[PDB]
Symmetry: D2
Subunit: 114 residues, 4 copies
């Protein structure tokens, strides 16, 4: 059956949620751009660890066991949360940046040359 | 003045945009989970390169020159695009995964213990 | 007091040690190039975690506390071990590759500029 | 024909070579621990880029074409050079740390299990 994401939360919603979470704990001081970037790298590491010993032939993530699916959800989420936090801290409008990048991607790879 | 993201595109919008982009070029074959993960790692590398030689004291990303701001927008976007693609390819509902992770984050770090 | 690395183990020594370690456990099957690369990325993550919340002003790694020095030693080592394993699995002569790269680095960055 | 690394350069040799390279260009200022770490992450990205679109079935890195072998040598080397630089900047004796980690690895993964 066709797979889709839920319509919410949006990236703005996530930005706002993370900002409130950090503000309640007085963590703004820890959230400088290079801290957030290094935290992002750490979470990408954790995500990679889930895949590192998977063979070419064994079942893919759609079929992993419950505890492994849970970990996968969690690490994908941790990466997104820091990416949002980082983008916001740099005053980058991430949704609109993605539109611009996708337009650039189309120009670099025209369908008739691929 | 207060900074916010635009309300669109949503993560579902980005998922759909990337899927159409890949489908037009017959790239589904290249987009297996471990390919997407390695591409994500590559983009995180490019993002890190923008920050690597910045000193502690010099101005932050909010004040970088136009070409550096453009690169920053682009690499943040490339990371998000592959993260979305990866989540979708694993049938993870990324927005709802983030809600669950944020709830877990609150439980691990109660405000009165921090 | 001048800082230096110890003269051993060499990269070849590390290669041989890791290969024997893996061979004793019948782990050759797990050590394909893309597995090793992803494991390397994981260990780079662990290394980054040690630095992620450090401020500009607090003490630097030369002065970290004992437990943090120990963790730093361990994660730097984990990165090196997988890098060696990956290079060896690809039949790349890593020490000689480094010489070649350093030569190229000199050319790209002339001293007078 | 057995695969081995060359016996030189050693990690100490690489340390000394990189330190002189940086010192000649007055780059000590750029080489703070977190700069070196981020540069390392960048080079791990470049390494990953070489592998990212490879299929399961096409030839593996032992059999890659000449230009791809050259790139692989270079990116493996870039990762090693920054790892050495970072370890040295933190006054970590990387060869001896690796021995300690390998010992710990043996304990965590006993051969009989
Ligand atoms: N200083 C911190 C600590 C945690 N988190 C949030 C974001 C991640 O989703 C998660 C990571 O938590 P941990 O590093 O405890 O696993 O918690 C945060 O934003 N800032
Ligand atoms: N096989 C590919 C090649 C490119 N891209 C898209 C996603 C990134 O935003 C950007 C990366 O392009 P490049 O690797 O050419 O810089 O293009 C993709 O989804 N799949
Ligand atoms: N399949 C494995 C598991 C572990 N290790 C070694 C290399 C690292 O130095 C350390 C990583 O162990 P862990 O992932 O248990 O921390 O042990 C290895 O070579 N291959
Ligand atoms: N500030 C710098 C710039 C370059 N390099 C060296 C280490 C790497 O092997 C290579 C990276 O160069 P580039 O980033 O120009 O590819 O050159 C370095 O040690 N310090
Ligand atoms: Mg995590
Ligand atoms: Mg990019
Ligand atoms: Mg480790
Ligand atoms: Mg490089």
């Amino acid at each position: 059956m066709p797979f889709r994401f839920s319509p919410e939360p949006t990236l703005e919603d996530i930005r706002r949620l993370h900002a409130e979470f950090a503000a309640e704990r007085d963590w703004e001081q820890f959230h400088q751009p290079r801290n957030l970037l290094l935290a992002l790298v750490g979470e990408v590491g954790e995500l990679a660890e889930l895949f590192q010993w998977k063979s070419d032939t064994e079942p893919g993530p759609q079929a992993w066991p419950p505890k492994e699916r849970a970990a996968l959800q969690e690490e994908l989420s941790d990466v997104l949360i820091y990416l949002v936090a980082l983008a916001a801290r740099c005053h980058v409008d991430l949704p609109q940046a993605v539109i611009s990048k996708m337009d650039t991607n189309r120009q670099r790879y025209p369908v008739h040359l691929s």
